Design a protein around this ligand. Structure first.
Ligand SMILES: C[C@@H]1O[C@@H](O[C@H]2[C@H](O[C@H]3[C@H](O)[C@@H](O)[C@H](O)O[C@@H]3CO)O[C@H](CO)[C@H](O)[C@@H]2O)[C@@H](O)[C@H](O)[C@@H]1O
Length: 231
């Protein structure tokens, strides 16, 4: 019924919201079965259409700068954590620069009987062998994986699940994030690095193809469902 969308645009990144939002209204989960809430974490004063729409929730979040912008992701999600458990059945995170090209239905929702959790295959690694996966390799990070270990390389920019299951992931990973800071370790790919470990312990109930991560200006043997805008 309810779909929480988590979205972060700080500094200039807010220039992505307008279109992400618009496309979402056309394509993403449009069935009267679903009510979509938008949690948009930003330091910008006003979003687009934020005045007319009651489902656009601006959350005041200052600019953390790179990498902490991406690194602190679950720290930032967890501020409204209690709100999130109230208002949403499912959560999904989109990288700021995504654009919906095609209709997305209930096909992507993890079942009940599952662990249900969702992840997308990184577009750069879908055609490569796991030696080529950019997994954090220092056993000093929480995000470390043994060489020749792991099934897929998962992307930072789209993830989700049952609200209860994806939050456990935010807190769990949020903690790993914190442990590494105590060791002065920053995983190589940051949150992506860490989510891949979690999805190693936790194979995701749904693994979406790279079509959902299709880069703008790459040729790939899929139809793009979701597109990645190029800066
Ligand atoms: C899709 C890509 O996302 C950002 O960069 C990601 C980076 O992309 C590499 C990819 O790893 C490589 O295999 C492919 O052939 O070329 C891309 C070069 O851009 O991959 C790492 C994983 O190691 C992270 O996922 C990075 O976020 C972005 O900055 C790129 O512009 C592009 O949109």
């Amino acid at each position: 019924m309810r779909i929480g969308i988590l979205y972060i645009c700080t500094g200039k990144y807010d220039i992505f919201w307008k279109d992400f939002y618009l496309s979402a209204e056309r394509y993403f989960m449009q069935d009267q079965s679903f009510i979509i809430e938008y949690y948009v974490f930003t330091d910008s004063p006003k979003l687009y259409d934020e005045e007319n729409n009651k489902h656009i929730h601006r959350i005041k979040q200052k600019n953390l700068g790179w990498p902490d912008n991406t690194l602190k992701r679950f720290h930032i999600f967890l501020r409204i954590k209690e709100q999130l458990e109230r208002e949403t059945d499912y959560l999904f995170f989109f990288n700021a620069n995504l654009l919906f090209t095609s209709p997305i239905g209930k096909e992507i929702l993890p079942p009940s009987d599952s662990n249900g959790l969702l992840g997308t295959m990184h577009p750069g690694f879908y055609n490569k062998p796991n030696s080529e996966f950019t997994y954090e390799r220092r056993d000093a990070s929480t995000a470390y994986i043994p060489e020749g270990e792991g099934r897929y390389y998962y992307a930072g920019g789209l993830s989700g699940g049952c609200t209860k299951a994806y939050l456990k992931l935010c807190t769990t990973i949020c903690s790993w994030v914190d442990r590494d800071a105590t060791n002065h370790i920053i995983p190589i790919w940051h949150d992506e690095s860490l989510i891949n470990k979690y999805f190693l312990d936790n194979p995701p109930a749904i693994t979406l193809s790279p079509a959902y991560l299709y880069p703008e200006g790459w040729l790939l043997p899929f139809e793009p469902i979701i597109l990645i805008r190029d800066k």
